[PDB]
Write a protein that binds this DNA or RNA. Structure first.
Ligand SMILES: [K+]
Ligand SMILES: [K+]
Ligand SMILES: [K+]
Ligand SMILES: [K+]
Ligand SMILES: [K+]
Ligand SMILES: [K+]
Ligand SMILES: [K+]
Ligand SMILES: [K+]
Ligand SMILES: [K+]
Ligand SMILES: [K+]
Ligand SMILES: [K+]
Ligand SMILES: [K+]
Ligand SMILES: [K+]
Ligand SMILES: [K+]
Ligand SMILES: [K+]
Ligand SMILES: [Mg+2]
Ligand SMILES: [Mg+2]
Ligand SMILES: [Mg+2]
Ligand SMILES: [Mg+2]
Ligand SMILES: [Mg+2]
Ligand SMILES: [Mg+2]
Ligand SMILES: [Mg+2]
Ligand SMILES: [Mg+2]
Ligand SMILES: [Mg+2]
Ligand SMILES: [Mg+2]
Ligand SMILES: [Mg+2]
Ligand SMILES: [Mg+2]
Lengths: 80, 87, 200, 81, 134
RNA sequence: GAGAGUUUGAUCCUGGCUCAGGACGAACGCUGGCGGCGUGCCUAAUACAUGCAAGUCGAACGCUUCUUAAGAGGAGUGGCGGACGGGUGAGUAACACGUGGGUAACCUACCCAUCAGAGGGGGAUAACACUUGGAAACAGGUGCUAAUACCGCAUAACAGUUUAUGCCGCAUGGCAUAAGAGUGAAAGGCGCUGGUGUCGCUGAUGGAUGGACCCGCGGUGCAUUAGCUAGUUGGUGAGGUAACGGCUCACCAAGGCCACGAUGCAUAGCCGACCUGAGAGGGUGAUCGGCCACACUGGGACUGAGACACGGCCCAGACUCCUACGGGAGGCAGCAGUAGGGAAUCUUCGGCAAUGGACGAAAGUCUGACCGAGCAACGCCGCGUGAGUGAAGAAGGUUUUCGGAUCGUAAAACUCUGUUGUUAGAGAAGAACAAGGACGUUAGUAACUGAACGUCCCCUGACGGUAUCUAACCAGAAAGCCACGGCUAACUACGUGCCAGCAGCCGCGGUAAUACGUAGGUGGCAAGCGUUGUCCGGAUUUAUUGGGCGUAAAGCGAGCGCAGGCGGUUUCUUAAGUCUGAUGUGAAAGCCCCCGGCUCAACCGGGGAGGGUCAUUGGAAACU
């Protein structure tokens, strides 16, 4: 069965109920000068019971749109 | 519907054709699903190069040849093979 | 287009005998014009390169645009010296093939024959003097045209066939056995200068 | 219109719209009667339930509403009943 | 510059500007605005025809015309050749090209185009100056 | 991966400017013979006369007019098509596009295949008949009339849903089985012999095709644009949608985006590709292909499988037209064409013969798609405008140091050729077909016709008597453009006298100008040449590849410092970056490589290769 994209990140916002904001924190080479630059992409993931807190390392799997911005589902809380 | 038909190529007054699978709505020389053969009427015995397996698979899937392609496939015996497969 | 003016004047400007006889240079071997007989100042490097390029294209009676395209074809060839390959292609040109076989006294005459269709390749009419003749192809005179004083005199007069051509008089049919060699070509013409010119 | 076929389609589409709106309003009235009866706690609730389902299916036929639309409506009615 | 500085403020090449800007802008009467169109020549009307004095090395009466182009820009153009038939209200065609002698002349009036008559008695380089082969 | 000219009395350096190369949907100037292929409103998404660009079906249905009962017409209703094909790029900085994925949140007429059904009735209404209003457009009234038009009833739950099991995934959940409750359909036509072939009709499923949505990443300028947001961010319910979802609504909270550039402003369709470059890159987004958006401006919905519909509807707006002044009508960014704007872009052409498309059982009708032809040297390619012989070198031009030199074997003269040109004859491929007529095999039948398949006969070309071939006659009809001071290949004479004028840069002309004008010569290219305009190069002149800052331009007057950038040695560990194996994909056409076809070439065709800072998966752990 086809697999949905899963991302590892760190929670940065949980004041919203049933949901969290996760950050991916990748690095990419600058297209012109090749220097490695800190690239931050953040997703809004759905938390069923508000289990995850701020500054937690979690995994999220892409899902059908759950709200205006939600597109991901919380899977695990790797660190607190 | 899905059609097997002749997409014209070549130059002015020097036609050439690619036998391609295309949706009937698509433009003649525009979007097409897949190419399956060639056809050059300018040769006395019209030269035909064909992917018989691809043609048979599409015919089973329901592709409808045009009139000229029907003649081409008859001369190549693909129509007879499809008839036998239907039986 | 095709040049049709004087031939001696072109040859003496180039300083070499296009016909190979030296007849043009025999008398008044100066550059053409009222400033010919008196000495002239030394030429620059660009002038030297231009003069060699003009030598080749006037030898083979070609226009600059077609000449440049042919030079690029020689470049695309991988093996051997670029200039040598370019000269070899120039020879393979149909006009020069007829001329080497000797069916015509001059390349102009050979070009007119080919253009009027008196020449055939493997028995098939070919009116294109630019036609590229490959090794082994049989060049022959059209049957209707074989009995013309022009080619008759040219064939009987022509005595020396280059080693790379094989010719038959009765059939009036010749063919390149092999590609010409550097020495077999004109050694006066320096192909390296032409290569540099088009290298720009 | 500038095309005879265009004029013909205007007439036919007008007639079809009249019929479709009429039948769709019939289905809506059936559902409306059932819902009001459910709120009132009447006695013919079951009869109205069957009639509402019947109207929804008959509307699905004739192409008034898509099949998914009809299925959702029937699910809604069943949960109400 | 450091690579980090380049990332923070990348290189930006100078912007080049045409030597004949008047030809690079059209006009739209409806919107009454200027468009960005690259044109080889442009038509105009002579608002004034006269003579001008060259810069220091040279001395002559260089013949010029002040022309309002089809895009409503007024420019100064030179009239090449010997003698001309241009008067004010004359419709002319302008091509690019500076006149080193004159201070603010950047355009030439094409001879033999529109009201500009070719140069009489011209016999060499006739294509320039727009005279028929006699 | 070539440089050259120019700052100075001369030199080195720095530095700008200019040139040598290539390209065009080009324009202009002079000139101009032909053929092949291609290209041709770049500006006003400005306004449009006129003609055409979407119809089809009588084997769905009832009428109606003529031809010696026929076929040919006419309008009806009804089915399908009209959402394709064609045009433009205005808008859009956005999941629009490109690329890579996801949908267990989706729909899909026509097409293929499978499983079922196809029973019974009923009321209409156009057409038509009259009849009111009117120029017509068209509006009505009454009275009939058929259907594959419409509606009920009957049966069909395999659909969906609920429960119980069984299996399974990625959270919601997916699949299979069984049961259960509520309901849902249809249409007949043609042809053979109540049965039946075939085209249709209805329910369900799968396939194919097309569409829908979500997501990672990528591709503009401006900070002399820093805050933006309030259905806004999330939740709970409800409604809605094919479908998930603030998509909508009511409540609950106060969240959400932002220097990793939000917001605002300006500009822009995106891409395959194309030009240039050694490459990195820079520029462009014509033609051709994909996607997107738009159809006089704005809004709305109807019909439909599919539209919020270029040649449909309603409303509003701007504009235009016809009127009998009562009332009506329209949208070329479809093909031509007109006006206007502009430097600047074509015929108001032939045909459905070929390919494709709509309808039809089919003949066939329609098809400004498309095939052709026309116009433009606009571009690329090809061939010419003659060939051989031909003088110590005719005359005439130019110049002479008056001997001569040069134009010049050039001409003349003689001998040839006919590509082309003209005249005549001969003359295609592109045509495969379909239908129709013969037969024959499979599956089906009780049997047929018929279905599918196969072999024969027959049938049809706008281009077009076109290309092409043959024969005869004539060197006769067919060469211009720019340049010649250095850069840069090409030099003399007059005329001129800082005047006239030239000039890409340096710079020429003031009475002995190779730089101006003319003439004679010469050089470059050639049916072209030259100028202008624009893009890349040279330009290391924004230097990531690949520059600099003591005096040439360039170190803030100095410090304290948040953010950010960078960071000493080492053990273990992780794998974000990093490297790598395998796999999928990066369409076709186009570049490039091979191989064929056009007499060659352009061009065309066949087969490859390449193209990603692509994605999935499997590895390594030196460096960060
Ligand atoms: K109809
Ligand atoms: K100087
Ligand atoms: K310099
Ligand atoms: K339709
Ligand atoms: K995407
Ligand atoms: K909600
Ligand atoms: K646009
Ligand atoms: K619009
Ligand atoms: K339409
Ligand atoms: K056709
Ligand atoms: K028509
Ligand atoms: K010069
Ligand atoms: K650098
Ligand atoms: K200091
Ligand atoms: K790693
Ligand atoms: Mg044939
Ligand atoms: Mg040419
Ligand atoms: Mg336009
Ligand atoms: Mg725009
Ligand atoms: Mg019906
Ligand atoms: Mg470079
Ligand atoms: Mg229209
Ligand atoms: Mg001929
Ligand atoms: Mg020189
Ligand atoms: Mg001069
Ligand atoms: Mg550069
Ligand atoms: Mg300084």
């Amino acid at each position: 069965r086809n697999q949905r994209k899963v991302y590892q990140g760190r929670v940065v916002s949980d004041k919203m109920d049933k949901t969290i904001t996760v950050v991916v924190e990748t690095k990419k080479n600058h297209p012109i000068y090749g220097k490695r630059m800190k690239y931050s992409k953040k997703y809004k993931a759905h938390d069923e019971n508000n289990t995850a807190k701020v500054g937690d390392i979690v995994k999220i799997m892409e899902t059908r749109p759950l709200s205006a911005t939600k597109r991901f589902r919380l899977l695990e809380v790797v660190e607190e | 519907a899905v059609k097997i038909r002749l997409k014209r190529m070549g130059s002015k007054k020097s036609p050439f054709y690619r036998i391609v699978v295309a949706d009937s709505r698509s433009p003649r020389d525009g979007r097409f699903i897949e190419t399956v053969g060639t056809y050059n009427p300018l040769k006395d015995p019209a030269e035909v190069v064909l992917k018989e397996d691809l043609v048979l698979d599409w015919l089973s899937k329901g592709a409808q040849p045009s009139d000229t392609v029907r003649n081409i496939l008859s001369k190549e015996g693909v129509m007879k093979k499809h008839h036998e497969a239907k039986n | 287009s095709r040049y049709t003016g004087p031939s001696w004047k072109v040859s003496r400007r180039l300083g070499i005998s296009l016909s190979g006889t030296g007849k043009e240079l025999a008398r008044r071997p100066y550059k053409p014009g009222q400033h010919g007989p008196n000495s002239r100042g030394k030429v620059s490097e660009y002038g030297m390169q231009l003069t060699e390029k003009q030598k080749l294209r006037h030898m083979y009676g070609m226009n600059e645009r077609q000449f440049r395209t042919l030079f690029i074809k020689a470049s695309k060839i991988k093996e051997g010296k670029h200039g040598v390959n370019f000269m070899v292609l120039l020879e393979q040109r149909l006009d020069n093939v007829v001329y080497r076989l000797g069916l015509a006294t001059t390349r102009r005459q050979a070009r007119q024959l080919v253009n009027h269709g008196h020449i055939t390749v493997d028995g098939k009419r070919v009116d294109i003097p630019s036609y590229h003749v490959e090794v082994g192809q049989v060049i022959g005179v059209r049957e209707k045209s074989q009995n013309i004083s022009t080619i008759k005199e040219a064939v009987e007069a022509t005595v020396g066939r280059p080693a790379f051509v094989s010719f038959d008089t009765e059939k009036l049919e010749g063919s390149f056995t092999r590609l010409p060699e550097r020495d077999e070509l004109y050694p006066e013409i320096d192909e390296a200068l032409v290569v540099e010119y088009y290298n720009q | 219109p500038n095309i005879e076929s265009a004029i013909k389609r205007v007439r036919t589409s007008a007639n079809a719209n009249a019929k479709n709106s009429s039948q769709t309003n019939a289905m809506r009235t059936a559902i409306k009667k059932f819902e009001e009866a459910v709120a009132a706690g009447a006695d013919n609730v079951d009869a109205l339930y069957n009639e509402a389902v019947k109207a929804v299916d008959m509307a699905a036929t004739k192409g008034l509403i898509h099949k998914n639309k009809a299925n959702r409506d029937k699910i809604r009615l069943s949960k109400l009943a | 510059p450091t690579i980090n500085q380049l990332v923070r403020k990348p290189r930006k090449s100078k912007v080049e500007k045409s030597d004949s800007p008047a030809l690079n802008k059209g006009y739209n009467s409806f919107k009454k605005t200027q468009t960005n169109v690259n044109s080889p020549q442009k038509r105009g009307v002579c608002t004034r025809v006269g003579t001008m004095t060259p810069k220091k090395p040279n001395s002559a009466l260089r013949k010029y015309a002040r022309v309002r182009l089809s895009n409503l820009i007024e420019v100064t153009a030179y009239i090449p050749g010997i003698g001309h038939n241009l008067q004010e209200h004359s419709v002319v065609l302008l091509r690019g090209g500076r006149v080193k002698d004159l201070p603010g002349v950047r355009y030439h009036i094409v001879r033999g185009a529109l009201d500009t008559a070719g140069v009489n008695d011209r016999k060499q380089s006739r294509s320039k100056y727009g005279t028929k082969r006699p």
